[PDB]
Each structure stands twice: as C-alpha cells, then as structure tokens.
C-alpha cells in the first residue's frame, strides 16, 4: 500500500515541475542579451602568503577585510595579515585532518573541523597571550564539511552524515538539526541577513533551510553529480552552486528554479569553490585543472582566468568590501589577486 | 615595518615562521601508513607494540629509531571518494585480509580493487598482509577452496590455495610504479614490524631512484 503514498509523492513532484515550467516565461540570457559585456579581466597576484607545509583545505576572510584564516593538513591554523603578509597567530590543531575553517564576524573566535567529527572553537582575545580552544562541539557522526558563524554564540555546521546542525556554543547543545538530505552535505552558505542558509550535498541537490524553525522551504535539483561549493548572491535572492560535472548554475529563491548555466567544452574537471563579487556581476570558481575562471554572472561568458597555482584550487574568497580575492590551493600557497 | 609597533609585529611574524619551519622538519621524518581492509580481519592487532593513542584512529608505534604513524579509516561510514584525498600522500597502504573467512573474501577483493586503482593511489605501493593463516590451513580440509572461489583447479591443499588467493589479489594491480608486498601473518607466532620496515625501506628507495630518472 506504500505505492499509494509513492504515487501521491510523484504526483506532487509532477505538479511542482509543471508549476516551475509555468512560471518560466523567459531566460536570464535572453533578457540580459542587451547589456554590454564586461571586457577582459586581468587580475594579477598582489601577495603570496607562504608558510604552510602541506595542502590548504580552507580559508576565510574576516569582516575587517584584512585578516584571514588558513587551515592546512600539516595541523596548523595560521591567521594572516593580508596587507603586510605577517602572521598574527599560528594555532596548533589537535587533529591534522581539517576540512574547514571560519572566522567569526566579530573577529574574536575561529572555528575548525574535519575528519574527527568535531567542530572546535578557538578564543583569540584571551587575557593571557595565547590562543586557547574555547569549546569542542561533538555531536556529529561524520566528518564536518563546513561551518559558519551567526553570532559569537551560534555556529551552524554541516557534516557527511547527511545532516546540518545549529549549535549553542556557550551551552554546547544542538539547538536545531536540519535533516532531510540523502547524501553527504559538502557545503553551506548563510544569507546576507543570517536568517536563511542553503546547503549542497552529494545527492546532487540543494535545499533552503530556515534557521529559526528548522524546516526545509525549497529544494533545487539541477545538477547530475555532487555539489562541492555554494554561494549566495549579495542581495540574498539567488545562489550559485558548483559541482563535479564542470558546471556552475544560478538558482533563484523566488522563481524556485534555475536561471542559467556556466559551462564550457574545454572544462572537464569539477568546481571546488565558488564566490561572487561585491556587486554580483562576476562569479569566480576554482577548478581541479589548477585554474580559477572568472565568469560573467549575467552573460555566462568567461571573462578572465586566474592561473597562478601549481595544484588544485581548494578554496576561494572575495573580500567583504570587494577589494581582493584570495585563493588557496593544494600546493601550500595562498595568493591575493586584484 | 617603519613604526615601532610594526617592527615588533614583524619580529613576532619571523618567530612564528621559524617555529613553523622547525615543526615542519620535525614532522617530515615520520612514516605515515594507511590501514585498510574489511572489518573482522585483524587490522587492529598486526603490530602488537601498537600503542593506539568516531573518526580516524591514529597509532604511533616506533621501531629502529623510526616513527610509524598508522591511520585506521574504518568506522567512518561515509563516501570514501570524498575524504580519501587527505591520505593521498601516505607512504604505503597496509591491507589486512582474514584467510579464515570465506564470506568476507569477495568484499575484501572488491575493496582491494577499489583502493588499488584509485586516481590518487595510482603510484602508492601496498603491503598486503594475509592474516590468520593457521585457521585457514586448519579449516581448508573441511571447507575446500571451492565454496568461495568456484574457479579453483589446483590440488586442494594449504600451500597452493594460499598461493592462488595471493595471486588473485595481486591480479588487480594493472599499474606500474606499484609493487604489492605480500606476507602471511599467523597472529600467534609472528612479529611483523620488521616486515613493514623492510617494505617501507624498499618503497622509499624506489621513490628516490625514480626521482633520479631511473624507471
């Protein structure tokens, strides 16, 4: 009798698909066919931050637009000064298998996590001179893929146990758990008002979660393979996903469907990271072919290329004030472009 | 670096740089190995001087003034394709197989095939242990090597059946630059840290001789 519920579910999916097709009256490309294309973009390496001894798996800018964290597999967590290339801190990690890092928006804390299934929070403004681990959030049954701060006291983490969770730091307990994915969640991104967030999992799907309740509002399926990266459009009414099938895509929360597709024939490797620009007219994307192609986020035409790395580009982040672009990679070097 | 505070901050930066360098040269003389194999195969008791120390379970036994770190990635229960590139730069891949189980044999064989022809481990050598040989040689007389491998044609005794299983495991190599060092631990009268030491010595010598052009 379960086939009755299955038929009702498939009827609901069919009605959803037909509603999506009914709301699709035009195309972003056909509309923006009239604007003028951005000329060739030539960003050049301004800084080179060296000092890691192994692959770099994550980085994150601070809100002040000058300092950034790097998490690496040699067990270190360095805090840089990107203007001067000084190292502000160097934090030794309890377990060298780290796959993510986050800088608090206030600048006081720094998170980290990886194969040990724990997200540990570090206190930078200690009364002593050292950086001490302030807490260890252990409630996940799979490696952590991403972690993002909301306050000094709320962090949201996504793990490869097919769940996302919202933590109360000073307490240590999962306030909410966002379940509903069927594959390993590989990335998350917070809305520019920190009330919603999207997650992209290995089941080739993205979802739109609500922080205060804990429900899933929308579900976007456009890819054929894993989703390794996700970003939110600056005004928070769209987001772009990158995947292992060499294809980025632009979804929009209001039309509840896909806007356009950024691919090419000479690109066969998967996207590792994506990020927008200060205004949303460019879309950067790190690839496994060691490059980083800048895209025209409204024409789907490749504008420039940041080819300066000798190994896969792991991480990628545009500065909060829009000035620079930092790209870490598996060859142990970060680079500040602009 | 003109201001007084800027000069002091640069001095702190240089101190951090030199501590990073010292930790790097100190952690470059460790030998990293990856323990694999199906569960219930002996991947937890190969080198009984093991000193263990859920995610990755490191283990740090030492032998002949050399530090061996062993990572057991079992019990992770995720998509291995997503976190296996963390161990893309280990020295070798230790693999344990329980010769006494005829049920876990094809699971172990497919897992060997998967980890042997991975794209990150296309030139990482394997140290295949065939654990629990004594029970195999005791029970082979009762349960022949035909309920597991129907293609068997040799004289059904211990030595030739074991050679056939070892050959069927090595038949999945399909790649140069990768040698599969076999051995048969018995778990009661064998001490096989010297086996890992010799295999790792040979692997590192081959890496070095392939860095000087020789192929």
């Amino acid at each position: 009798e379960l086939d009755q519920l299955r038929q009702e579910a498939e009827q609901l999916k069919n009605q959803i698909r037909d509603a999506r097709k009914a709301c699709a009256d035009a195309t972003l490309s056909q509309i923006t066919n009239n604007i003028d294309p951005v000329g060739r973009i030539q960003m050049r390496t301004r800084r080179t931050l060296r000092g890691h001894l192994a692959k770099i798996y994550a980085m994150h800018w601070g809100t002040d637009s000058r300092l950034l964290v790097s998490a690496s597999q040699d067990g270190k967590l360095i805090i840089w000064d990107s203007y001067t290339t000084n190292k502000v801190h160097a934090i030794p990690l309890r377990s060298s298998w780290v796959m993510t890092c986050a800088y608090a928006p206030s600048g006081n804390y720094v998170a980290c996590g990886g194969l040990d299934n724990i997200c540990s929070i570090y206190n930078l403004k200690t009364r002593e001179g050292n950086v001490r681990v302030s807490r260890e959030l252990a409630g996940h049954t799979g490696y952590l893929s991403c972690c993002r701060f909301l306050d000094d006291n709320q962090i949201v983490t996504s793990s490869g146990d097919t769940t996302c969770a919202l933590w109360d730091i000073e307490t240590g307990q999962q306030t909410t758990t966002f379940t509903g994915h069927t594959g390993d969640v590989m990335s998350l991104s917070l809305a520019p008002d920190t009330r919603l967030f999207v997650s992209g999992a290995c089941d080739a799907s993205a979802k739109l979660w609500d922080v205060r309740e804990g429900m899933c509002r929308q579900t976007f399926t456009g890819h054929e393979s894993d989703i390794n990266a996700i970003c939110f459009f600056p005004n928070g009414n769209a987001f772009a996903t990158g995947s292992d099938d060499a294809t980025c895509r632009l979804f929009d929360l209001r039309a509840d469907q896909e806007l356009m597709t950024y691919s090419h024939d000479n690109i066969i490797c998967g996207i590792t990271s994506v990020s927008f620009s200060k205004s949303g007219r460019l879309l950067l994307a790190g690839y496994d072919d060691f490059n980083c192609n800048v895209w025209d986020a409204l024409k789907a035409d490749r504008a420039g290329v940041l080819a300066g790395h000798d190994n896969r580009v792991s991480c990628l982040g545009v500065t909060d004030d829009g000035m620079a672009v930092a790209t870490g990679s598996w060859d142990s070097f970060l680079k500040i472009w602009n | 670096t003109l201001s007084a505070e800027e000069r002091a901050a640069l001095e702190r930066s240089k101190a951090i740089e030199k501590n990073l360098k010292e930790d790097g040269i100190s952690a470059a003389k460790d030998v990293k190995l990856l323990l694999l194999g199906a569960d219930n195969s002996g991947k937890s008791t190969i080198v009984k001087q093991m000193k263990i120390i859920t995610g990755i379970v490191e283990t740090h036994f030492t032998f002949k003034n050399l530090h061996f770190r062993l990572f057991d990635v079992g019990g992770q229960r995720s998509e291995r394709k997503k976190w296996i590139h963390c161990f893309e730069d280990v020295t070798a891949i230790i693999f344990c197989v329980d010769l006494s189980d005829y049920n876990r044999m094809h699971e172990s064989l497919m897992l060997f095939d998967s980890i042997c022809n991975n794209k990150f481990f296309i030139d990482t050598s394997i140290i295949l242990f065939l654990n629990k040989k004594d029970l195999f040689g005791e029970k082979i007389k009762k349960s022949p090597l035909t309920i597991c491998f129907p293609e068997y044609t040799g004289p059904n005794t211990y030595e030739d059946a074991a050679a056939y299983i070892q050959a069927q495991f090595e038949s999945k190599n399909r790649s140069p630059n990768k040698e599969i060092y076999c051995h048969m631990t018995c778990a009661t009268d064998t001490n096989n840290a010297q086996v890992i030491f010799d295999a790792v010595t040979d692997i590192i010598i081959a890496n070095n001789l392939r860095g000087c052009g020789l192929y």
Partner: single-chain antibody, 231 residues
Framework: VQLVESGGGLVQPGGSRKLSCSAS????????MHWVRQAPEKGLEWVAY????????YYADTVKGRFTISRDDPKNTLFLQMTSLRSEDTAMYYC??????????????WGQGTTLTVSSDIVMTQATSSVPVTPGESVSISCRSS???????????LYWFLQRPGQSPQLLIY???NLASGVPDRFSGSGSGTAFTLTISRLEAEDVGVYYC?????????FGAGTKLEL
C-alpha cells in the same frame, strides 16, 4: 594575570642592586616587557624594553650603560641589574607587559611597584595641571605633541593611562580611540595629529586620579606631565 616586583630598599650612591619581577598567570614568553619608573612626586618615565625572545633591547638615554635588562623565560622572571646608582634613581619601578600584533593592546597590565631609595625626543605636553570636578559633569583632558603622531599607515600612537591614588596605572585608550578591555564606555578618545583629547562623559567616583598621555611612535617612549582630577 599577576606581576610582583622585588628588590627594593635603600642603597648608597655608586652601589648596585638587581630588581626582579616574577610573572605568573599568562604566556610570559610571548610578551615584550618594559620597566617604567616614577619619581617620588613626579610623572612616569620609561626606562628599558626587552623584546619577546630577547631579540631587540632599548634603553632610555639617561640609564644607558648603567642598567641592563634581561629575561629568564623558563622561570618566568624579568631582571633589571642597576649599576652606578645616583640620587636621581630614587623612584618606584613598575613592570609592564606588551604584545605586538595587528590589533593588540600593549601596556595593558602593570605590575605593583618596588620602591627603591638611593641616599630628538617627542615632547608630550599636558598643558593643564589640575582640574576640580564633581561627580556628574562631563570632563575633558588635553594632550599635545611636539611631532605629528599620525603615522603614514593610518594609526595615531597615543595611549591614555589612569593612576588611582596609591595603585598601579592602568590603560584606558590605545592608539587614541580604542577603549581598553575592561574599561567603562564613559571614556572616549578624540583628536588629530598633534592635538588630542580624552572626554570623561558621565563622570563618577573611582575616576579621581592622574591621567598621563604616552606616545609610542618611536623609542624612547615619553609620557606626559600628568593631569590630576579631584573633588
């Protein structure tokens, strides 16, 4: 965080004495360290500085060659060996910790003081000398420099200190606008290069003391004359 100094007492001129500060409760090996003396009824005065790792050392030009600063890190102790004392060294010596990175708060914790009796430079100018105040009115204090403290990188190196009667002086404001951790929001630092101000809005008790303005643009550091508050 704690710092206690030892080595006080009387000396005859020409003699020698070693002060020692024993630090406990922080990562002593990562802080720079100063010595700041204060004559019987005068203002503060910088004496010596030793880096973290003892890499770089500076001395005031009045104690150059006579004094020698050094630190022992495994024992968490800072030494000042004084040679050829004079009648002008009869002052109370403080020990100050200081850590330097982007965004730090140097001069944040001061020791307790060990009285010792013995039988060009930027010139800060605390124009006034005493201000009679009553609890409730907003009060401002004015400092002035001989050289533009605004460096080219954008920072203006001016620090404000408050010494309550019979206690160590504590940091209020660093780099002329940032409030120190643990200081009420009543205080506010303003001004431009060569002209600074500290406005104690919504005054209260516990704010009766002496306010010194220190520069940190280049060594040797020079404090100010010291403006006093009273009731």
């Amino acid at each position: 965080v704690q710092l206690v100094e030892s080595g006080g007492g009387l000396v005859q001129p020409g003699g020698s004495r070693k002060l020692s500060c024993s630090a406990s409760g922080f990562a002593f090996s990562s802080f720079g360290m100063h010595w700041v003396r204060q004559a019987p009824e005068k203002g503060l005065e910088w004496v010596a500085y030793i880096s973290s790792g003892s890499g770089t050392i500076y001395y005031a030009d009045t104690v150059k060659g006579r004094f020698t600063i050094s630190r022992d890190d495994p024992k968490n102790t800072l030494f000042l060996q004084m040679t050829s004392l004079r009648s002008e060294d009869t002052a109370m010596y403080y020990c100050v910790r200081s850590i330097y990175y982007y965004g730090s708060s140097p001069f944040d914790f001061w020791g307790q003081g060990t009285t010792l009796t013995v039988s060009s430079d930027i010139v800060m100018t605390q124009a006034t000398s005493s201000v009679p105040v009553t609890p409730g009115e907003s009060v401002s204090i004015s400092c002035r420099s001989s050289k533009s403290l605004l460096h080219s990188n954008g920072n203006t190196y001016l620090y404000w200190f408050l010494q309550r009667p019979g206690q160590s002086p504590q940091l209020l404001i660093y780099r002329m606008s940032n409030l120190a951790s643990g200081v009420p929001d009543r205080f506010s630092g303003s001004g431009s290069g060569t002209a600074f101000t500290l406005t104690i809005s919504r005054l209260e008790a516990e704010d009766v003391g002496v306010y010194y303005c220190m520069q940190h643009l280049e060594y040797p550091l020079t404090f100010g004359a010291g403006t006093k508050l009273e009731l």
